[PDB]
């Protein structure tokens, strides 16, 4: 067995180093230390200093230099024994503070060990570098294994979800948290390897086919879907949630996923140093000479929607080696070689359209000089020229009931270009997960686990709706682990009345949800929509509202003294500043309908699709007008939170370790940040200070039952037989609490309990033997 063998790969890898002999004389040590620090002005930069006498209240130490301080024993920030640097679970730890909490993450992650769980959630700070745990040769040992009985690892909270799963038959969640560029999406990609392969038919095609092309359809999804920021060369720039579905036996049935608020202003706009799409520089640089020539394609310098951010590459990646692997696994899912084609002319022709030129006329509309770009882009649409060209610059609207015909100046028809752009792209996505969802999904699921992989809380220089949308929901979702963690647990504890002295653990981020989202009294996402209905409405006067309403007002906002196009926002991750440019026709996400009366025309079966389809290019009409970017968000996310809150949850927190991408480098000021907003000490705190394990005494019968001399699974009180089966055993009730409805128990008692029983191969079978009819 490789847990056991101290040779294993998965010991090399899993597990932490055997010490020395030197260790062993320290380990022994009498000495106690102080985690202090040499300078008061920096918090989070801590050093090892030796406790060297003390009071009733106080401690004394010496500092590395030789100097020696004291400090109050309330505010010592005592060091843990080294026995537990390395510690799989901190809800082990004597002492649990900041410094020592960080300290067992650095050893761990010195060692190329990631994973370190904090009570009954995981916790992943990014290596940064390929390390071998997730082979199948892993995968396999994970399997059906108890959480204590193996190392922390992203296969065994998924693992356990879904025992839990099949056990409870209740349908289950992972929930994976982070900043932008921690993990969530590699460990997302985790999750459904092992659910697969563990969860899967051997490969009857269909089960084993079924897989490979679940499995097949990340990579196309990341294709068009992730870019290269500023804080991650693979950033999701849209969230999904992806669900497995199991039949009542407990196989993979299907799956199916939902995408997220994709920015789709990408596509036109990039800011220095990040890029495009992969998708874009892939087909490029990747696409056959023939290809190359019926698209009319050139080199990514070429095309202004390219050129602008001044980066084509990404450090390690190849567009062509990538370009492959993505059609590898469109026919893996089933696109046509016909669709596939489609979908690059698609590519191709926003390319082309970008590079269009409006310039000014005679007059105040603009006009096109060379039409180039024009026809290249309506040939592979297999649109008109003229009527694309008319559309851009003269579209047609109405004027009381007046059919009237308007003429854009440069700015107007550069915008309407953008606009095409944009819609292009957002149907695709669309589509291209429409269309998959399709091979994926085809067997009313029994059960399912839900895994939502969103994009991540960020911070650019200039920070705009999308900044905010994203946020706010890396936002809802903080308040989602604090709710289940803090608020429904002693929720629990108050009725049960098992005399559970409340705590506030200080984290709530209700008023910022609230600043945002909130209809009565109007957040910020409700005087923009209000904005965005008003005809003489403006970027001024929209802040000017915003700054109206909370300016001084709300403790989460902030009218700043520097700008006048600019409100700040308090969020748990910390107070981010947004501009407000654009923000009304980025809510309002408009298209002229000429446009889509021109593409509707398409001789292209997937460009036609993309503006005749009505679950594609149709528009809910909230009243007068169509809804607001703004609103469906909302409502999506609403209906999310909705479906998350009828499963068990699993959080796994993924932790950036420092803010250059870079492998051993674990800055302590942004790991502490990180563990301090997202509340990881708390988790751990009620773990410990709580009782989690809880059964009534109906299920008492289920393992503790014959526990004692007679005392059976049958009995007319269950809360007699409690205290008679452990008492026996005498068991700490001070453990334990038997308020109400069921029993309480602290701190995985249930499980010392659970074991002291468990792996009791003393009477477990072993008592019919001895006599047996060995008498004669
Ligand atoms: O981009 C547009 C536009 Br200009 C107009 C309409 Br009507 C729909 C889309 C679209 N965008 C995303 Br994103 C999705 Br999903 C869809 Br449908
Ligand atoms: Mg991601």
């Known amino acids: 067995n490789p847990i056991h063998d101290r040779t294993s790969d998965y010991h090399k890898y899993l597990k932490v180093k055997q010490g020395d002999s030197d260790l062993f004389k320290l380990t022994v040590s009498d000495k106690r230390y102080i985690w202090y620090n040499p300078d008061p002005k920096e918090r989070d930069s801590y050093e090892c200093g030796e406790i060297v006498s003390e009071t009733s209240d106080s401690f004394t130490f010496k500092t590395v230099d030789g100097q020696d301080r004291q400090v109050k024993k309330d505010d010592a920030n005592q060091r843990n024994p080294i026995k537990f640097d390395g510690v799989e679970d901190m809800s082990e730890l004597s002492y649990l503070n900041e410094p020592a909490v960080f300290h067992n993450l650095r050893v761990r992650y010195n060692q190329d060990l990631i994973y370190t769980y904090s009570g009954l959630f995981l916790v992943a700070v990014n290596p940064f570098k390929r390390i071998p745990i997730y082979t199948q040769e892993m995968v396999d040992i994970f399997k059906g294994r108890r959480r204590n009985e193996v190392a922390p690892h992203i296969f065994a909270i998924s693992d356990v979800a879904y025992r839990s799963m099949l056990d409870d038959r209740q349908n289950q969640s992972l929930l994976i948290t982070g900043e932008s560029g921690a993990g969530k999406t590699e460990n997302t990609k985790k999750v459904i390897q092992y659910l697969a392969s563990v969860a899967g038919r051997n490969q009857a095609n269909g089960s084993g086919v079924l897989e490979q092309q679940i499995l097949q359809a990340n990579p196309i999804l990341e294709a068009f879907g992730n870019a290269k920021t500023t804080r991650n060369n693979n950033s999701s720039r849209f969230g999904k949630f992806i669900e497995i579905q199991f039949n009542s036996a407990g196989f993979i049935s299907g799956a199916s996923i939902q995408s997220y608020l994709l920015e789709k202003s990408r596509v036109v706009f990039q800011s220095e140093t990040e890029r495009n799409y992969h998708i874009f520089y892939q087909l490029l640089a990747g696409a056959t000479a023939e290809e190359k020539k019926a698209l009319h394609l050139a080199g990514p310098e070429?095309?202004?929607?390219?050129?602008?951010?001044?980066?084509?590459?990404?450090?390690?990646?190849?567009?062509?080696?990538?370009?492959?692997?993505?059609?590898?696994?469109?026919?893996?899912?089933?696109?046509?070689?016909?669709?596939?084609?489609?979908?690059?002319?698609?590519?191709?022709?926003?390319?082309?359209?970008?590079?269009?030129?409006?310039?000014?006329?005679?007059?105040?509309?603009?006009?096109?000089?060379?039409?180039?770009?024009?026809?290249?882009?309506?040939?592979?649409?297999?649109?008109?020229?003229?009527?694309?060209?008319?559309?851009?610059?003269?579209?047609?609207?109405?004027?009381?009931?007046?059919?009237?015909?308007?003429?854009?100046?440069?700015?107007?028809?550069?915008?309407?270009?953008?606009?095409?752009?944009?819609?292009?792209?957002?149907?695709?996505?669309?589509?291209?997960?429409?269309?998959?969802?399709?091979?994926?999904?085809?067997?009313?699921?029994?059960?399912?686990?839900?895994?939502?992989?969103?994009?991540?809380?960020?911070?650019?220089?200039?920070?705009?709706?999308?900044?905010?949308?994203?946020?706010?929901?890396?936002?809802?979702?903080?308040?989602?682990?604090?709710?289940?963690?803090?608020?429904?647990e002693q929720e629990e504890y108050l009725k049960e009345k098992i005399n559970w002295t409340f705590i506030d653990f200080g984290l709530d981020s209700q008023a910022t949800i609230d600043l945002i989202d909130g209809r009565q009294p109007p957040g910020i996402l409700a005087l923009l929509d209000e904005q965005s209905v008003f005809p003489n409405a403006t970027d001024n006067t929209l802040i000017t509202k915003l700054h109206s309403h909370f300016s001084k007002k709300n403790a989460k906002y902030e009218e700043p003294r520097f700008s006048k196009?600019?409100?700040?926002?308090?969020?748990?991750?910390?107070?981010?500043?947004?501009?407000?440019?654009?923000?009304?026709?980025?809510?309002?996400?408009?298209?002229?309908?000429?446009?889509?009366?021109?593409?509707?025309?398409?001789?292209?079966?997937?460009?036609?699709?993309?503006?005749?389809?009505?679950?594609?290019?149709?528009?809910?009409?909230?009243?007068?007008?169509?809804?607001?970017?703004?609103?469906?968000?909302?409502?999506?996310?609403?209906?999310?939170?909705?479906?998350?809150?009828?499963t068990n949850p699993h959080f796994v927190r993924c932790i950036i370790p420092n803010n250059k991408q870079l492998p051993a480098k674990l800055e302590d000021k942004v790991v502490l940040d990180q563990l301090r907003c997202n509340g990881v000490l708390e988790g751990i705190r009620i773990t410990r200070k709580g009782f989690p394990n809880r059964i009534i005494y109906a299920d008492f019968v289920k393992?503790?039952?014959?526990?004692?001399?007679?005392?059976?699974?049958?009995?007319?009180?269950?809360?007699?037989?409690?205290?008679?089966?452990?008492?026996?055993?005498?068991?700490?009730?001070?453990?334990?609490?038997?308020?109400?409805?069921?029993?309480?128990?602290?701190?995985?008692?249930?499980?010392?309990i659970e074991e002291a029983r468990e792996q009791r191969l003393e009477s477990n079978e072993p008592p019919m033997d001895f006599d047996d009819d060995i008498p004669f």
């Open 302 to 488: 070429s095309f202004n929607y390219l050129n602008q951010s001044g980066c084509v590459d990404i450090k390690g990646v190849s567009d062509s080696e990538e370009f492959k692997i993505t059609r590898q696994a469109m026919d893996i899912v089933g696109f046509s070689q016909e669709e596939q084609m489609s979908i690059f002319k698609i590519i191709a022709g926003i390319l082309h359209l970008g590079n269009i030129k409006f310039e000014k006329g005679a007059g105040e509309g603009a006009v096109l000089k060379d039409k180039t770009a024009l026809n290249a882009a309506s040939t592979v649409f297999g649109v008109n020229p003229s009527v694309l060209e008319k559309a851009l610059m003269e579209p047609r609207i109405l004027a009381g009931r007046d059919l009237v015909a308007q003429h854009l100046n440069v700015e107007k028809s550069s915008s309407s270009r953008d606009a095409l752009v944009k819609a292009l792209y957002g149907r695709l996505f669309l589509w291209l997960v429409k269309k998959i969802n399709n091979v994926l999904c085809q067997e009313r699921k029994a059960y399912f686990i839900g895994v939502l992989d969103i994009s991540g809380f960020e911070i650019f220089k200039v920070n705009s709706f999308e900044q905010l949308c994203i946020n706010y929901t890396n936002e809802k979702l903080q308040q989602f682990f604090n709710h289940h963690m803090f608020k429904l």
């Open 565 to 646: 196009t600019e409100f700040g926002v308090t969020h748990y991750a910390g107070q981010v500043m947004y501009e407000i440019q654009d923000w009304l026709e980025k809510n309002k996400d408009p298209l002229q309908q000429d446009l889509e009366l021109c593409f509707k025309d398409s001789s292209d079966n997937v460009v036609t699709k993309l503006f005749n389809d009505p679950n594609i290019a149709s528009r809910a009409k909230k009243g007068a007008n169509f809804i607001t970017v703004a609103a469906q968000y909302k409502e999506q996310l609403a209906s999310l939170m909705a479906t998350l809150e009828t």
């Open 703 to 752: 393992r503790y039952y014959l526990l004692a001399p007679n005392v059976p699974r049958d009995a007319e009180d269950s809360q007699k037989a409690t205290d008679a089966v452990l008492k026996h055993l005498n068991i700490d009730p001070e453990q334990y609490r038997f308020g109400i409805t069921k029993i309480f128990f602290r701190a995985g008692q249930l499980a010392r």
